[PDB]
Design a protein around this ligand. Structure first.
Ligand SMILES: Nc1ncnc2c1ncn2[C@@H]1O[C@H](COP(=O)(O)OP(=O)(O)O)[C@@H](O)[C@H]1O
Ligand SMILES: [Zn+2]
Lengths: 70, 191, 35, 277, 204, 51, 287, 146, 94, 48
């Protein structure tokens, strides 16, 4: 059952994602992003995105509907 | 009279016969046209289908109340192959079973002018079976009368059983006019 | 067959009617290409 | 006589596949169709099959029902051998979640007036992405009961609940005007097998050998990445010990993939070499 | 559902003469019939600690696809093990921290049935964290199981009954509390106060 | 393993849940109501939750 | 002709539902319908299907009542509902052909030039796909034998659009297997492959016995194909192949050995950490 | 009826073989996938692209933008004058025609000689001795893009 | 007639076959290859010919019986090794 | 409204310029006379 979970994670990390700018790290596994659509959202960071590499005002890719910083 | 009917039309090579002016093909075409017209005019809610008896039987129009499409489809029928009356009648029985309207009388008219080559035992057995499924077979004979008269009489007798006048046989050895004979036949008199 | 073709004229006409739901949009025809 | 929160719509596999296919076969249009089935007693809506409807041009509304088409196909399917009434109607809301608009409420009201146990099914092809089938079933509430204050739907069993209603539907009136219904699937064993046949792997695939050149190249790629991860793992463990993880996890993943791939290919090679001679 | 419970009741007390029917039901494809099979196992090997039945129930509880069947299997396990109340927590504790909320609810109810009217300590300890869960019915089952276990227990004998009574009062008196959690709390108060503090619940 | 699986399931649920807007508080007018302007669309009075 | 045909899960489920429907409403030997799809080169894609009323005599094997009017009516209706789908074949749920199938295919070829017959076995097999694809070709046998109109096998496959694919995955989530190679599943896959190969060899052997005893005639194409099989059998006793195979086995096993060494080292490190943590905890608890 | 318009955008970076960062003009920038029948090599930064509306996949490339000025400049250029219509300046015709045409048609002459082909010439002169006509003639003869 | 196990053919045995001295078996095999009937190679250094293909032809009942026997042996081997593998890995098969 | 496209006699097919949003075309209906409705001044378009 732990399998299929990595699978669903890699599937939510899909191709048609939307690019945006990661503005600030509000807290663990959550942050504020600004989608290139022109609006700011308070979305949830997926796990294993190298919080160290997730610096302020970086280029990120978000789920097309959940806007999660995939 | 609520009714579902199947016109079984023979289109074997023997329809090339020119005895019926202009040819047997147009003679039987006008015959089916007139009989379908009469039956449709009688209780238009009745429905009509068309079976062709060839080397391998075929169905050209499932039970429908319209006669124009039936006539148009039949117009393209051509003489070819040989008649298979058993397969034709069984296909007609299947189609009547499949008829949408169950409040109808199961009748089948067949222009069977040809030398029918079928065994007498299975012939009478099939006639009795059709009687069991309550079929009314009308048989138009024009052709090898000397050959098929006894078999058509066996049809009529077995189907009637006792008082079962529903089945009819009309034979027309001479060729004055097939349409005239059929209109002045007892089958269409009640319609 | 002409009657069936007239029925197909009818289906074309109803196709136009359904796809021509009037509240259209207006757009420039900027650029024009073909393959 | 008030409907309780145990009524459940049993959507057949065929019905679901047809509905989702039609949604993605006409997105972004609001496709519509009837749902042929049979209410069993009072707590079941067994949706045997669904019913595609021609694109009526006027979006989705009662004007798109096309009664002549509906009745003629009803009779024709009945002839085919599918004698079921018209239990509810399905219609897609591409992208815009699952809920009822004003026209949707009007159409559902007409359906309830025809027979006050039908349902309105909503499917979202865009958001029904792989692994998630966002479908919903709804029925209206009566203004007289709502004003009287009695709850719209009785609660005699712990079923019916157990579901978190979407905030989208809450805003669009998930309880003020209508209420959701639980969706069950009647997965027969035969249908499940025939679905499995989709990605079922043929014995050729099972017993075939992966290309040896590509196999060696992949082995080298993974082994070199494992070497780098081993260097990082040593650095991490040494610094941890001196002071008193991701490298270990990645190393475990790489070792597992190497072992499985290599053992699989070697065993397949032996099976083949002493099965085919 | 009714037929399932009825079959289970019919095949009561028959420790081993039922194995054929248990096998048939457990093999059957209908999830409700598999649940009936779990109930049949419980009623058959009721109050016996029969390890074959325990193994079957547990394997179903972690193998079958229907969460209803999993929950029923865990409850039936409790039914099997009530005769040695201290023994069941050792098993159902590992389930209690399960990812399947139906399995968690089954663990709650199994502990409650097993240690009913016993005032066991580790059972209450396990129930508490479950009493604080994000899911609704798991909280409901935890509350009801705690009521069953602590029925007729003074604070001195069980130094947590006052805390759970206050917890019941709090959970009942709340704005945002889930309906099912409130229902479980109300039934828990009823059970804990059942019989005017004169009747206990014992399966033997 | 159970902790791993539970973490992944919670992550799946939360990610599949949609996002949230960000707004600047113009004024905390009235109890339980907060006037907040959200870029780019207009400014709304929100019914603040309990936490 | 057409070289490949790919059926869809929607078609599969529609066929299964049709057969179950007919069986429930009355015992029957077969159920028949039409297959709508689209053409892209000689790769037909059956994207939909629909039943048609049909019954035949089991004894005479020459009388049946396919309803062409029904067929055309519902084809027009499905054309109205969705445009880009046209009659491409017909399906029947018969484990065996019949002497009528050719006549019904003659009936269907009026609607489609390259009409494809599809035998769909509702009974679930375990080795191959449940659908078989046939096409009627009649020609002067260059074999000089009397020519009789008969079918020809067509490569068949199961494929789904994204819509049907997500739907089927959601239906199958309960028993769906991991979409990734796990060692146990791969071993089971090899075992299943051996099962399939054994079954195919047994079937070929039964046919060969039938021909040898004489209950059947001899198909030159079949003999040619089996000749090609036996002639394509490899030779695994050759030294220049044995050496290469040993080399590759040694390479794979050195990779496996390095992997196992790393895994053991990691396990020992974990055990060391556990020992340290346990001793620290016990010391703290004592003091 | 069964056609639907795509979305015009421009690639910005060839990410992993299947992922392309495409900026929808007058809109946001996505990461999208490329359908089967396309030339990933053909797809390069700055190339126009027709993404799908729903799945935002690269349906097919599209040629680079055309500026209005350059369009009016190039696509509308009526040039049809034979060298016979340039009466004098036979020598200057020789030099021009040489430099412009010969490297275009039959560059193997330059390859064999060893010299690299020339690019451009000044062609300066008093106000109306004939320069636009002299260029129009060579443009018409070459029938290339003027 | 020669099976794939020992499909190597020799100039000498071809000579013992259709009457020709061993200086033109090369040309005979060459003509076969060219017309596209058999495939393989010729190693005249050791005076042998390797075949890996034969234009299939209609056969006789005795030949089919022998082929059936060969396939009997092949199927028996396949079943034996299937049983071996399943028994060995019984504790990991899903 | 920006134009009436001559009203094409019947089927007026008016043009609208919904501000900051878009420009569309409309039949309107439900009013008395296609001409006395409006020529070039403010109007209320229905939502859907
Ligand atoms: N050698 C020539 N033969 C024919 N016409 C000429 C010649 N030289 C100049 N002209 C005429 O003089 C005009 C010069 O126009 P144009 O070429 O546009 O300007 P410029 O002479 O400055 O290049 C042309 O229209 C052309 O007809
Ligand atoms: Zn709607």
């Amino acid at each position: 059952e732990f399998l299929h979970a990595q699978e669903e994670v890699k599937r939510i990390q899909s191709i048609p994602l939307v690019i945006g700018q990661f503005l600030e790290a509000v807290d663990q596994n959550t942050a504020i992003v600004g989608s290139t659509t022109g609006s700011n959202y308070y979305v949830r960071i997926l796990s294993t995105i190298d919080r160290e590499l997730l610096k302020p005002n970086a280029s990120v890719a978000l789920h097309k509907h959940s806007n999660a910083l995939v | 009279v609520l009714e579902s009917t199947m016109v079984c039309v023979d289109n074997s090579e023997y329809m090339r016969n020119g005895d019926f002016l202009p040819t047997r093909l147009q003679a039987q075409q006008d015959a089916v046209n007139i009989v379908c017209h009469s039956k449709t005019r009688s209780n238009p809610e009745n429905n009509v289908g068309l079976i062709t008896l060839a080397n391998d039987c075929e169905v050209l129009t499932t039970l429908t109340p319209d006669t124009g499409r039936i006539l148009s489809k039949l117009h393209t029928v051509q003489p070819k192959g040989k008649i298979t009356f058993c397969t034709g009648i069984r296909v007609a029985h299947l189609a009547l079973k499949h008829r949408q309207g169950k409040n109808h009388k199961m009748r089948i008219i067949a222009f069977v002018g040809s030398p029918v080559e079928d065994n007498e035992k299975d012939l009478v057995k099939l006639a009795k079976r059709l009687k069991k499924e309550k079929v009314n077979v009308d048989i138009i004979n024009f052709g090898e009368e000397e050959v098929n008269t006894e078999k058509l009489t066996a049809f009529v007798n077995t189907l009637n059983g006792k008082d079962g006048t529903g089945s009819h046989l009309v034979t027309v050895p001479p060729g004055p006019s097939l349409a005239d004979a059929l209109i002045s036949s007892p089958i269409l008199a009640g319609e | 067959e002409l009657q069936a073709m007239k029925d197909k004229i009818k289906e074309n006409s109803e196709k136009i009617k359904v796809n021509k739901t009037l509240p259209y949009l207006v757009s420039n025809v900027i650029e024009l290409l073909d393959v | 006589p008030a409907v309780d929160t145990a009524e459940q719509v049993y959507i057949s596999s065929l019905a679901l596949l047809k509905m989702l296919k039609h949604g993605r076969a006409g997105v972004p249009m609001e496709v519509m169709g009837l749902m042929l089935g049979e209410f069993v007693d009072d707590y079941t809506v067994r949706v045997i099959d669904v019913f595609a409807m021609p694109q009526s041009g006027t979006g989705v509304s009662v004007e798109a029902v096309d009664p002549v088409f509906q009745a003629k196909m009803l009779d024709m399917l009945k002839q085919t051998g599918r004698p079921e009434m018209v239990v509810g109607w399905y219609h897609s809301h591409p992208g815009f979640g699952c809920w009822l608009s004003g026209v949707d409420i009007n159409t559902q009201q007409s359906f309830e007036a025809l027979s006050e146990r039908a349902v309105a099914v909503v499917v979202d092809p865009i958001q029904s992405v792989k692994g998630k089938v966002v479908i919903d079933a709804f029925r209206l509430i009566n203004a007289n009961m709502m004003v009287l204050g009695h709850e719209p739907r009785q609660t005699t069993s712990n079923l019916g609940h157990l579901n978190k209603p979407s905030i989208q539907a809450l805003i669009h009136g998930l309880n003020r005007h209508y209420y959701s219904i639980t969706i069950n699937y009647r997965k027969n064993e035969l249908e499940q097998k025939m679905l499995l046949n989709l990605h079922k792997k043929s014995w050729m695939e099972g017993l075939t050998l992966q290309d040896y050149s590509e196999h060696c190249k992949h082995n080298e790629s993974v082994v070199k990445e494992m070497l780098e991860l081993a260097k990082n793992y040593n650095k991490a463990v040494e610094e941890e010990d001196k002071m008193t993880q991701d490298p270990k996890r990645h190393l475990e993943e790489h070792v597992d993939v190497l072992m499985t791939s290599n053992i699989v290919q070697c065993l397949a090679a032996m099976l083949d070499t002493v099965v085919f001679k | 559902r009714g037929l399932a419970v009825g079959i289970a009741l019919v095949m009561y007390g028959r420790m081993e003469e039922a194995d054929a029917l248990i096998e048939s039901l457990c093999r059957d494809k209908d999830p409700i019939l598999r649940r009936s099979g779990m109930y049949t196992v419980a009623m058959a090997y009721c109050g016996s600690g029969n390890n074959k039945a325990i193994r079957r129930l547990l394997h179903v509880a972690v193998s079958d696809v229907n969460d209803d069947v999993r929950r029923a299997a865990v409850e039936s396990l409790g039914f099997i093990l009530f005769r040695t109340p201290e023994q069941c927590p050792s098993v159902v504790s590992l389930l209690s921290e399960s990812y399947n909320p139906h399995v968690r609810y089954g663990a709650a109810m199994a502990l409650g049935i097993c240690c009913a009217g016993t005032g066991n300590k580790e059972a209450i300890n396990l129930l508490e964290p479950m009493t604080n869960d994000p899911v609704n019915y798991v909280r409901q089952g935890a509350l009801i199981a705690s009521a069953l276990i602590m029925i007729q227990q003074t604070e001195i004998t069980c130094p947590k009954v006052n805390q759970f009574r206050q917890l019941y009062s709090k959970v009942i008196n709340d704005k945002h509390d889930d309906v099912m959690a409130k229902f479980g709390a109300i039934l828990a108060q009823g059970i804990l106060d059942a019989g005017g503090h004169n009747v206990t619940i014992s399966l033997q | 393993l159970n902790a791993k699986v539970r973490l992944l399931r919670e992550e799946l649920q939360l990610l599949q849940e949609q996002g949230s807007y960000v707004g600047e508080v113009v004024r905390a007018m009235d109890k339980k109501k907060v006037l907040v302007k959200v870029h780019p669309e207009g400014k709304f009075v929100v019914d603040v939750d309990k936490n | 002709a057409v070289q490949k045909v790919v059926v869809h899960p929607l078609v599969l489920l529609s066929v299964v539902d049709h057969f179950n429907r007919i069986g429930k409403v009355g015992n029957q030997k077969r159920v028949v319908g039409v297959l709508l799809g689209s053409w892209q080169k000689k790769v037909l894609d059956v994207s939909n299907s629909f039943a048609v009323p049909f019954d035949e005599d089991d004894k005479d094997d020459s009388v049946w009542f396919l309803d062409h009017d029904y067929l055309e009516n519902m084809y027009g209706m499905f054309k109205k509902v969705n445009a880009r789908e046209r009659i491409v074949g017909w399906y029947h749920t018969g484990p065996k052909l019949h002497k009528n199938d050719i006549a019904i295919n003659e009936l269907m070829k009026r609607y489609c030039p390259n009409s494809v017959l599809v035998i769909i076995d509702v009974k679930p097999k375990d080795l191959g796909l449940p659908t078989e694809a046939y096409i009627s070709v009649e020609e002067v046998h260059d074999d000089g034998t009397p020519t009789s109109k008969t079918f020809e096998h067509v490569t068949s496959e199961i494929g789904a659009e994204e819509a049907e694919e997500v739907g089927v995955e959601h239906l199958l989530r309960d028993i769906k297997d991991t979409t990734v190679g796990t060692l146990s599943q791969r071993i089971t896959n090899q075992v299943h492959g051996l099962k399939g190969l054994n079954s195919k060899l047994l079937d070929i052997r039964s046919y060969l016995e039938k021909v040898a005893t004489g209950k059947l005639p001899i198909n030159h194409q079949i003999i040619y194909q089996l000749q090609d099989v036996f002639n394509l059998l490899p030779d695994v006793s050759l030294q220049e192949f044995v050496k290469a195979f040993y080399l590759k086995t040694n390479d794979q096993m050195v990779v496996v050995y390095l992997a196992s060494l790393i895994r053991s080292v990691v396990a020992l490190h974990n055990l060391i950490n556990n020992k340290i943590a346990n001793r620290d905890a016990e010391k703290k608890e004592g003091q | 009826l069964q056609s639907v318009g795509q979305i015009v955008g421009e690639v910005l970076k060839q990410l992993t073989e299947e992922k392309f960062i495409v900026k929808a003009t007058n809109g946001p920038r996505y990461v999208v996938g490329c359908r089967r029948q396309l030339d990933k090599s053909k797809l390069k930064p700055g190339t126009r692209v027709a993404l799908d509306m729903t799945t935002l996949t690269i349906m097919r490339y599209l040629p680079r933008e055309v500026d209005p000025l350059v369009y009016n400049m190039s696509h509308e250029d009526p040039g049809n004058v034979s060298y016979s219509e340039i009466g004098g300046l036979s020598e200057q015709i020789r030099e021009l025609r040489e430099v412009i045409e010969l490297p275009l048609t039959n560059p193997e002459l330059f390859q064999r000689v060893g010299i690299i082909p020339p690019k451009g010439c000044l062609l300066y002169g008093p106000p109306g001795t004939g320069k636009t006509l002299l260029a129009r003639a060579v443009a018409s003869q070459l029938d290339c893009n003027f | 007639t020669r099976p794939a196990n020992h499909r190597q053919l020799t100039f000498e045995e071809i000579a013992k076959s259709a009457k020709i001295t061993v200086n033109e078996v090369e040309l005979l095999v060459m003509k076969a290859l060219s017309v596209g009937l058999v495939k393989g190679s010729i190693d005249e250094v050791d005076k042998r010919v390797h075949m890996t293909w034969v234009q299939p032809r209609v056969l006789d009942l005795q030949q089919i019986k022998g082929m059936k026997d060969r396939l009997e042996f092949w199927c028996t081997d396949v079943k034996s090794m299937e049983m071996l593998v399943e028994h060995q890995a019984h504790d990991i098969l899903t | 409204c920006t134009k009436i496209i001559n009203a094409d006699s019947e089927d007026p097919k008016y043009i609208i310029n919904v501000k900051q949003f878009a420009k569309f075309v409309v039949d309107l209906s439900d009013q008395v006379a296609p001409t006395d409705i409006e020529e070039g001044m403010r109007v209320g378009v229905d939502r859907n």
